[PDB]
Structure 1
Amino acid sequence: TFNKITPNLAEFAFSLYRQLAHQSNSTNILFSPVSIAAAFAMLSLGAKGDTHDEILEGLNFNLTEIPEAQIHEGFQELLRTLNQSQLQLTTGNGLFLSEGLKLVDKFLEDVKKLYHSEAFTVNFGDTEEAKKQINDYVEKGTQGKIVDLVKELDRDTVFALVNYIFFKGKWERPFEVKDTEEEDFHVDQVTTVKVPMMKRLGMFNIQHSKKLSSWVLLMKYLGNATAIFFLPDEGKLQHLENELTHDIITKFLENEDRRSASLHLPKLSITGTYDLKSVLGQLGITKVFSNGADLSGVTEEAPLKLSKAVHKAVLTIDEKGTEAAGAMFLEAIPMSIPPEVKFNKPFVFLIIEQNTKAPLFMGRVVNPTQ
């Protein structure tokens, strides 16, 4: 029912998330476990030795157990599913290599075949123009959604990696725009701010979890994906974050039971931008960014390290995700008081690709206006 690497990606998702959440309980979090992991597993094709092994271990692959071919086969199938589609996910990874380097052909080939990805040569002698060309690539690829991604380069940069994802999904069962109104969002136990709040009375895949002390909502998107939202009980955000597991999430995803509920969900447009050298360094991925990097799969003659690595994720949630008329359907709603479930205080979510079950996004909203 799942890709061989899905459990690893879930662990990586939680490792990275918990790292961000450990530092700050006031920040929104948004990133793609999948896009980041695929960017580094792609990179590992050009790496050898400890350089190579740290990357894959830092992505939660135990190399004593999982053969490398299974890793790359895993990613190749997952990325194929994302490029095939009503989902209209946009994800891209660009490698930007000094045009003075003699590049190994097999690497350029592998980056194409396995990772459906792009390698470019640039003149890092002109720092500003290199930055422009990198940022124009990302801008072009996001049809303008992501601008000025890279703000600066080290003067000694010879290799940069930029990884982006943008998604605005379309609910299978959408909200009515007429019902969206400004509501309070409880940023803390004594403070609110106003946000646009969508609402619907409907038959939802929704339940309360005593294990997680949270409400758990699953909503399907058109195309191959599902959003799962977790609404912690009062004072239980940290508990929620600590108790998530792959096996718990999998059991939610397996449940198809629906019950009536009055759902309030904010209309969101949120982003996360991360320096991957910093964030993956804390996960143990260090050598590839250091002078001792073994990237002889990329270039044989010359020293090479990854100078710059950036991720940016953008997610939009709204009523429909499209101007198009939806498929018409009727839900039978019982004559009984539905629970009111309001995503009007900090919550956690994941977005899951349905064929593979892989975690396309993981995030937290603590303030929709940050």
Structure 2
Amino acid sequence: HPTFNKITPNLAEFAFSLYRQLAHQSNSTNIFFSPVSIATAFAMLSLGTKADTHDEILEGLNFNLTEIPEAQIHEGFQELLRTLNQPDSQLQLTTGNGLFLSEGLKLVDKFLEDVKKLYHSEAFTVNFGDTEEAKKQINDYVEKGTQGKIVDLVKELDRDTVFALVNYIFFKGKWERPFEVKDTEEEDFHVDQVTTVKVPMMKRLGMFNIQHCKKLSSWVLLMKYLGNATAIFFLPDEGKLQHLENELTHDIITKFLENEDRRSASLHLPKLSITGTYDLKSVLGQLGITKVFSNGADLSGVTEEAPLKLSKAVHKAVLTIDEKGTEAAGAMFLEAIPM
């Protein structure tokens, strides 16, 4: 029956495929994104798109339009977003989608209604003549949504901006099997073959959902959150890091997710705070998403007054893992200007 698992495997395959582009960029830096924060921003944009440039977006997101009608992908998203913003009684998870439009704009009243309904989006009128005030007002939305975790999403806002599409996601949940703080003890982490970093390492000796796949050449750890979330860790055999990355595939994830068999083990894993702050333009480029970022761009779904194009696609995410759980937040920023 349901729609989210009509789009899920497509999401998943996108993420990985996005990942591999980020990982091809630097081998030396932490990566952290929200594949959902990104992906939904480009689909409610795609509502406002036509022809080539529309097709690349949807296609670019690992959707195969012959096999699935356009109209169902958005019904799918409408479902995904409903289901994420349900009240898990123990876990707190929130997404939100916003439009910020210049006063002067007259929109295609359908496009507006579409985003309001399907992607439950919020619409604000601003004056992009007061660049610093508009910058402020956007960054507050994301601050208010991400509950203070993402504060400077938009650093450089363009003077001639006609609209901004912003979305957020906020996660805070607890382990089921939490770490006892008294055990967290500083050890070595071996970044590079020549770089060695001392880290506070959380420790438990217990019955974990762990296993090792010769396939992936990895260890695999599944950590439940209290509630309808789960964290999955993959520790590659020495030399097999890049292997691990290429082997990743949705269905392999689903296999793990059906296993609930516990092994006893001695588990040491770090406590974490990182971020990732990306200008996606070049990355999405390799994924075949160009034309929206060109003067070939059709956004006549949005407004008829002028030919728009997309100027900036800038995403940011922040991870914090400790002994009691994790709080993570991401946001996607898309700005559109005239030719």
TM over 0.5: yes
Q: Answer whether contact 1:7 1:246 (CA < 8 A) is retained.
A: yes
Measure, in 2, the Cα distance between the counterparts of 1:331 and 1:201.
49
1:127 Cα deviation after fit: 2.0
Identity %: 99
Q: Call closer, same or farther: CA 1:313–1:91 in 2, change over 3 Å.
A: farther
Q: Call closer, same or farther: CA 1:151–1:173 in 2, change over 3 Å.
A: same
My pick for the range that moved more, 288-297 or 219-228, is: 288-297
Measure, in 2, the Cα distance between the counterparts of 1:134 and 1:198.
37
Q: Call closer, same or farther: CA 1:314–1:256 in 2, change over 3 Å.
A: same
Query: How big is the alpha-carbon RMSD for the aligned residues of Structure 1 and Structure 2?
Result: 9.1
TM-score (norm 2): 0.89
Q: Which structure 1 residue ranges, 5 or more long, are not aligned? A: 336-370
Where 2:207 maps in the other structure, the secondary structure is strand
- Per-residue CA distance 1:326-349 (angstroms, 9 max, x = gap): 9999999999xxxxxxxxxxxxxx
- Per-residue CA distance 1:276-319 (angstroms, 9 max, x = gap): 33332331222222233221221123222233322222222111
Q: Answer whether contact 2:150 2:329 (CA < 8 A) is retained.
A: no
Q: Answer whether contact 2:202 2:269 (CA < 8 A) is retained.
A: yes
Q: Answer whether contact 2:315 2:332 (CA < 8 A) is retained.
A: no
1:4 Cα deviation after fit: 0.6
Measure, in 2, the Cα distance between the counterparts of 1:38 and 1:288.
16
Measure, in 2, the Cα distance between the counterparts of 1:326 and 1:75.
18
Measure, in 1, the Cα distance between the counterparts of 2:141 and 2:253.
36
Answer yes or no: is 1:243 the counterpart of 2:247.
yes
Measure, in 2, the Cα distance between the counterparts of 1:2 and 1:100.
37
Q: Answer whether contact 1:180 1:198 (CA < 8 A) is retained.
A: yes
Higher relative contact order (CA 8 A, sep 6+): 1
Measure, in 1, the Cα distance between the counterparts of 2:286 and 2:214.
32
- Per-residue CA distance 1:79-108 (angstroms, 9 max, x = gap): 111111432124333332222110222222
The count of aligned residue pairs is 335
1:149 Cα deviation after fit: 1.4
Q: Answer whether contact 1:166 1:313 (CA < 8 A) is retained.
A: no
My pick for the range that moved more, 284-293 or 72-81, is: 284-293
Q: Call closer, same or farther: CA 1:195–1:329 in 2, change over 3 Å.
A: farther
Q: Answer whether contact 1:171 1:222 (CA < 8 A) is retained.
A: yes
Q: Which structure 2 residue ranges, 5 or more long, are not aligned? A: none
Where 2:99 maps in the other structure, the secondary structure is strand
1:322 Cα deviation after fit: 8.9
Q: Call closer, same or farther: CA 1:331–1:100 in 2, change over 3 Å.
A: closer
**Which residue in 2 is equivalent to 1:30?**
32
Where 1:322 maps in the other structure, the secondary structure is strand
Q: Answer whether contact 1:166 1:315 (CA < 8 A) is retained.
A: no
Q: Call closer, same or farther: CA 1:297–1:86 in 2, change over 3 Å.
A: farther
- Per-residue CA distance 1:42-61 (angstroms, 9 max, x = gap): 11111111121111011010
- Per-residue CA distance 1:22-72 (angstroms, 9 max, x = gap): 111111111111221111111111111112111101101011111112211
Measure, in 1, the Cα distance between the counterparts of 2:287 and 2:128.
28
**Which residue in 2 is equivalent to 1:47?**
49
